[PDB]
Amino acid sequence: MSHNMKGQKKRLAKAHKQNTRVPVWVIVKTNRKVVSHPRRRHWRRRSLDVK
């Protein structure tokens, strides 16, 4: 239970909601040409350089 401030928690929330797959409708729109994403990650890896 490390204690974050408002901005630190906001940046963690941004990282969390960035950690999402590309939408299937986006894949359909791009015709399976944008399927990947540079901000995908896992929580148990090299940590965020955000906090």
């Binding site: 906001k10 963690l12 929330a13 909601k17």
Partner: peptide, 9 residues
């Protein structure tokens, strides 16, 4: 009023 902040920001 009760207030909280979420992990969606």
């Amino acid at each position: 009023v009760r207030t909280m902040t979420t992990m969606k920001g």
